[PDB]
Design a protein around this ligand. Structure first.
Ligand SMILES: Cc1cnc(Nc2ccc(N3CCN(C)CC3)c(F)c2)nc1Nc1cccc(NS(=O)(=O)C(C)(C)C)c1
Length: 127
């Protein structure tokens, strides 16, 4: 089962703006998570062909990954921090939906999510 096209990272029809919270999401949240030892499965779209997971995109219909999020942030795709936080949450939820408790990938997601939430807990006051 073939890979779908990746999620968009630009869209001229979508409104957007720069906010101090979005800057933090790139400079602090994304850039820190990227360096975590367990980041790598989440740095690009899942390659379900290479992994021989032909049902991955049968089950995950709203895929999301940190490579996509990074590009969206660099490309000023978002209107607000909540939109970006939603993409991270989609990424984590997708992992917990597809995999079994106790799977290595779930342990990895959980560690990354712990760090994410620590960073979001310090999200600066808006504007
Ligand atoms: C984000 C995520 C969510 N859920 C999974 N699940 C999952 C399930 C089963 C297996 N394996 C596959 C091989 N097979 C023999 C045994 C079962 C499995 F490997 C993973 N995996 C995720 N990410 C990931 C993990 C590893 C490797 C890459 N590599 S990649 O090519 O996609 C890359 C380098 C482009 C990120 C991604």
């Amino acid at each position: 089962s073939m890979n779908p096209p990746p999620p968009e990272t630009s869209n001229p029809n979508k409104p957007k703006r720069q906010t101090n919270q979005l800057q933090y999401l790139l400079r602090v949240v994304l850039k820190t998570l990227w360096k975590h030892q367990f980041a790598w499965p989440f740095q690009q779209p899942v390659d379900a062909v290479k992994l021989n997971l032909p049902d991955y995109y049968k089950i995950i219909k709203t895929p999301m990954d940190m490579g996509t999020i990074k590009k969206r942030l660099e490309n000023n795709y978002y209107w607000n921090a909540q939109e970006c936080i939603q993409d991270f949450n989609t990424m984590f939820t997708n992992c917990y939906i597809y995999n079994k408790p106790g799977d290595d990938i779930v342990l990895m997601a959980e560690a990354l999510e712990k760090l994410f939430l620590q960073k979001i807990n310090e999200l600066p006051t808006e504007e």
